[PDB]
Symmetry: C4
Subunit: 118 residues, 4 copies
Amino acid sequence: MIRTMLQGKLHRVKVTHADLHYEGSCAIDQDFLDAAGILENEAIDIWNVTNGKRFSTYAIAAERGSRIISVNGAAAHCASVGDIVIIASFVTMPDEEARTWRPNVAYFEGDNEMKRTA
Amino acid sequence: MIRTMLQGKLHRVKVTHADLHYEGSCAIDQDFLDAAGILENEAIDIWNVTNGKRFSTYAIAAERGSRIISVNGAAAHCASVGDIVIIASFVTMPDEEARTWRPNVAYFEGDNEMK
Amino acid sequence: MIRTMLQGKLHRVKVTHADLHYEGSCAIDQDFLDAAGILENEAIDIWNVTNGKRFSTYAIAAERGSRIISVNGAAAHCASVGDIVIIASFVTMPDEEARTWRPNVAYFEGDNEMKRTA
Amino acid sequence: MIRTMLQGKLHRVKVTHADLHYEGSCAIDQDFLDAAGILENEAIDIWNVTNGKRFSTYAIAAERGSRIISVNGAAAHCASVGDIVIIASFVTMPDEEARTWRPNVAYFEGDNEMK
């Protein structure tokens, strides 16, 4: 049988300003995507720690080094600039692989400064 | 391992019909389904830009050229006529393929005119 | 790539009385499960046409011919006796199979009298 | 085709801890995970019998014998200490296997004593 496992997550990133509208997606600095193992166009779950909302959308890449986290445009109702969120992707795999699977986790503080641990 | 990826979407289509008598699906102009790669009987997510509601149902085809987006059944509780929505479907594939995957996106203006 | 397709559904069944508690599941007359192609322990989505609620749980079989549809017990908050619901299961399959896939649909009226069409 | 089936569940466990500072997961006594077949880092659904909320997160192991059910992070918005919940995981498998599939269920009473 096939398990659904946390692939990776961006832990407590902050939603930022962004000039562009992102058409229902969440735009995410490519560096952050790299660290969490998240792909452009991948389904993602976003858990808003500030307001408690939980929603699902898809990831798009923002410019590397922009530190952008944006639901600007069509997804603006579920998060606001300043809100602290967790962004997760989930993958499927056989049970044996699942049993020793290690998610790709990136932790954030401050001005979306990324760390390997908390 | 296997990723879940955006297969395609209809971006900012307008709801044209919303009846609370059968069938719990969203009926979509076949031309629109064709552009977004969405299949009859495929699971779809619908994100209401107008009222913020987010729900899931399945697609059925409406008459080609009709430019209908009809939210039927229980789903009629979650969108009204005139609401702007995004309709999306997701597919799975091996990670290796997902790295180069490109979704099928259709954009709209006015009264469901596809760009 | 792999599609998520409507496997089958019970269209506008009515939630009934039931003496037993069903532990978070929806108990469903085995005859109805047969017609919609739904399995015991299968994940199911329930769309409540009466109150607009949409939730996901799993199916268990009720006695054949009981005509039971019950969320009695731990799932009682999302539907009430008399409410009209649609119960769906979804399966995955390759795109080619998906393109000619036909869901198993059962329609209901009256005292959960089942029909092949509407 | 491939079915989604209940893999296992913890039936009517009580929430023992709920902190809104890391990590967005549900920490569960390893003995409980063992009984229900739920894995560390597995997606789980949580159905709050007490307040009716239904949400999804992932599992992590708590200390064996602790009888802890800890809803952390944003999930702390959806359950409080003393709430009764059901925690479930789902798996996929071919239809042929799904026809004979049996979930792993653990029942509880009192303060998270497994039957």
